[PDB]
From a paper:
In this study, we identify a family of complement inhibitors from the hard tick Rhipicephalus pulchellus, hereafter termed CirpA (Complement inhibitor from R. pulchellus of the alternative pathway). Functional and structural characterisation reveals that members of the CirpA family directly bind to properdin, inhibiting its ability to promote complement activation, and leading to potent inhibition of the complement response in a species specific manner. Whilst many molecules act to control inappropriate activation, Properdin is the only known positive regulator of the human complement system. All CirpA structures share a lipocalin fold with a short N-terminal α-helix followed by an eight-stranded beta-barrel and a longer C-terminal α-helix.
Using this strategy, we were able to purify CirpA1, A3, A4, and A5 and determine their structure using X-ray crystallography to a resolution of 2.0, 2.1, 1.8, and 1.9 Å respectively. Overall, the structures appear very similar, with the biggest conformational differences in the tilt angle of the C-terminal helix H2 as well as variations in loops between beta strands 4 and 5 (L4-5) and between strands 7 and 8 (L7-8). We identified three regions with high conformational variability between homologs. All these regions are part of the observed binding interface between CirpA1 and properdin, and hence the conformational differences might render other homologs incompatible with binding human properdin. Another CirpA1 residue undergoing a conformational rearrangement upon properdin binding is Y122 which forms a hydrophobic pocket around properdin P377 together with CirpA1 residues F122, Y131, and F150. This pocket is incomplete in all three CirpA1 homolog structures. However, it is likely that the homologues have evolved to target properdin from other species, especially given the identification of multiple CirpA homologues in a single tick species.
Residue numbers in the entry: 29, 45 to 59, 59a, 60 to 114, 114a, 115 to 203
Write the structure that this text describes.
Amino acid sequence: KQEEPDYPINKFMNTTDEIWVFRTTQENVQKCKKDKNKYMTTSATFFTRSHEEQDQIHEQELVGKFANFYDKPDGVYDRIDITGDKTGVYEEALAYASKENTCGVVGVWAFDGETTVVWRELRVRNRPNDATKVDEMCKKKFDDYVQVVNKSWTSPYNEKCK
């Protein structure tokens, strides 16, 4: 089995397009969850992460310091260590990215008060109104994962999202 390429998360998040959460295994679902990148250096990205509660937008300014997921020296930056999130997310890592980064599968690690909470999201550049144009290879990587961990997923997005 040929080794999959590492998926650079700095290239995935380097866009002015909104990156919407299209699928998630998160239990406490944030409706209309999305990211808007604002600035990026070689060591960190700066982005606005938002979601809606009762149709009202809640925003946070987050910082992600690039790193390699396996802590390999000089490895590909497929991971960000996150500061500024009041929900406790401290790391995300890009498990798959489509060509031109139109879609990505992102694992999330958070800390509540007791232990690390882990889930996974399928993220799409621009509004995923036409699901038939979202890369099926991206969907299948997410499907393969939810089959392995035996979990169901929901979609935080609908047209109503601001």
